[PDB]
């Protein structure tokens, strides 16, 4: 298989605008949302049909209860952070946890937090410790590191449980996640454009006379086209004072393409 990942996000907002949820949680497999919960619905629900079709109501009922609990815990933690920062107004709190199963069979795992969209605490599951970016985080670090069992628990979750969940979900969504739609690529400053491809991971570049020119190249973002596929571009400027061979190079899911201009 290609590299795949499972990530779960939380967002807490301390003084949200009317109607807007104080708490939102979304899980992803690769770029695909798979689950969602927020403080307005108070229900955990599938975001992909291949999640809905393979997980019974008791799964969603149980995680609905858990997320209701985790929502409250997030509120309490944010309240403590904003208290110790001595901040007024609305502030944000974020968590991201997840793992990757690499093509070569190796794994990664990660867990971190943010306050107002900036790194706050970062877990190291090898040294079993938290990296604190400032003194509010440093205080939380001491509290969280005080019981070793907590650290051991996250190491186990990240290295065993997360990867097991990922493999299970990969099988559920295989018709989506493991497919390949090759790109359609054209040249049109020279613009090289690709569209219609899946997975979104693609590498496009320009070479001049068989040499790459990285910092003369403008790299466009890989963007969702809305139909499950993606598009992207890269551009380069023409030297009108010299003749040069320009070629667009595209790599996508184990296939290389060259378009000579």
């Amino acid at each position, epitope marked *: 298989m290609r590299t795949h990942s499972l990530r779960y996000f939380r967002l807490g907002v301390s003084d949200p605008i009317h109607g807007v949820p104080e708490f939102i949680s979304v899980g992803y497999v690769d770029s695909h949302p798979i689950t969602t919960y927020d403080s307005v619905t*108070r229900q955990k629900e599938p975001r992909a049909p291949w999640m809905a079709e393979n997980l019974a109501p008791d*799964h969603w*009922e*149980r*995680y609905t*209860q*858990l997320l*209701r*609990g*985790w*929502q*409250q*815990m997030f509120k309490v933690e944010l309240k403590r952070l904003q208290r110790h920062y001595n901040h007024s107004g609305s502030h944000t709190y974020q968590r991201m946890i997840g793992c990757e199963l690499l093509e070569d069979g190796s794994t990664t795992g990660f867990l971190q937090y943010a306050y107002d969209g900036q790194d706050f605490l970062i877990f190291n599951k090898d040294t079993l410790s938290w990296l604190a970016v400032d003194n509010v985080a440093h205080t939380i670090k001491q509290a969280w590191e005080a*019981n070793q*069992h*907590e650290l*051991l*628990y*996250q*190491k*186990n*979750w990240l290295e*065993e*449980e997360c990867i*097991a*969940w990922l493999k299970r979900f990969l099988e559920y969504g295989k018709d989506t996640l493991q497919r390949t739609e090759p790109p359609l690529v054209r040249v049109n400053a020279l613009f090289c454009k690709a569209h219609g491809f899946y997975p979104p991971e693609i590498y496009m570049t320009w070479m001049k006379n068989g040499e790459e020119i990285v910092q003369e190249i403008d790299y466009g973002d890989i963007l969702p086209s809305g139909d499950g596929t993606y598009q992207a571009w890269a551009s380069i400027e023409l030297d009108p004072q010299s003749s040069n061979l320009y070629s667009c190079h595209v790599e996508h899911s184990g296939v290389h393409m060259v378009l000579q201009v």
Partner: antibody, heavy 109, light 116 residues
Framework: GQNIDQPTEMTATEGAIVQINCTYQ??????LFWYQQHAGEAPTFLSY??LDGLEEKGRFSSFLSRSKGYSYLLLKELQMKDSASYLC??????????WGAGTKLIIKP | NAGVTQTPKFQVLKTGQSMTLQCAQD?????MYWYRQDPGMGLRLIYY???????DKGEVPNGYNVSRLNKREFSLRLESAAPSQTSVYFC??????????????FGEGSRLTVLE
């Protein structure tokens, strides 16, 4: 997960050592707990393991092997006051506890 | 600083009679649980409450109901007692649920005997 097993009863002598076994088969694993419950009393937390190996706390140690789905609770220098039931419990993938039926430990003075 | 306080310690009931077991915890815990303990088997969860404002069934909810009255209190109701509900009931609480390595804190137990 779906089951957890531990011997119904064990008898050992005062001053000696006893090892209480617990095996489990679960859909996923998020930690193994041991609790002590004196007859007619409340269970109380004794130990937690979640990575592999042995952890010591006073006269008690608890061991875990995740790959074998196996834990033991080791009690050293047994005293009469160790007479109690010992409950093994495993947290499954959905963080739900699954409880062993308990091991009644009898101590001969 | 009393921990988990459940009542009553003992109760005899006639089949069909109603009964409420009380449980309070003063440890500022968020999660509460009701278990029954019977000979020859492990503790079985009846209902639980992951947080203030939510509850859900456990493994053996039939014949029972619960009310998470507030953050401190979680009551267990037997609307129409049956002989099979003869058991020892344990209230328990934890700081959170599904969150790390946190253990359970148990009440003293309530012994119920239901007779025809």
């Amino acid at each position: 997960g779906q089951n957890i097993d531990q011997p119904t009863e064990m008898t050992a002598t005062e001053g000696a050592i006893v090892q209480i076994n617990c095996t489990y088969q679960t859909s996923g694993f998020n930690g193994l707990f041991w609790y002590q419950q004196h007859a007619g009393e409340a269970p109380t937390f004794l130990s937690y393991n979640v990575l592999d190996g042995l952890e010591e706390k006073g006269r008690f140690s608890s061991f875990l092997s995740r790959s074998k789905g196996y834990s033991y609770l080791l009690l050293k220098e047994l005293q009469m006051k160790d007479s109690a039931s010992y409950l093994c419990a495993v947290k499954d993938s959905n963080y739900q506890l699954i409880w062993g039926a308990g091991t009644k430990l009898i101590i001969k003075p | 600083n009393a921990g988990v306080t459940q009542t009553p310690k003992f109760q005899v009931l006639k089949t069909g009679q109603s009964m409420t077991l009380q449980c309070a915890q003063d440890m500022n815990h968020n999660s509460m649980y009701w278990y029954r303990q019977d000979p020859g088997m492990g503790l079985r969860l009846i209902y639980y409450s992951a947080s203030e404002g939510t509850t859900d069934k456990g493994e053996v909810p039939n014949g029972y109901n619960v009310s998470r009255l507030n953050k401190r209190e979680f009551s267990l109701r037997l609307e129409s007692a049956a002989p099979s509900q003869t058991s020892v009931y344990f209230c328990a609480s934890s700081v959170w649920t599904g969150e790390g390595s946190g253990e359970l804190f148990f009440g003293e137990g309530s012994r119920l005997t239901v007779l025809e």
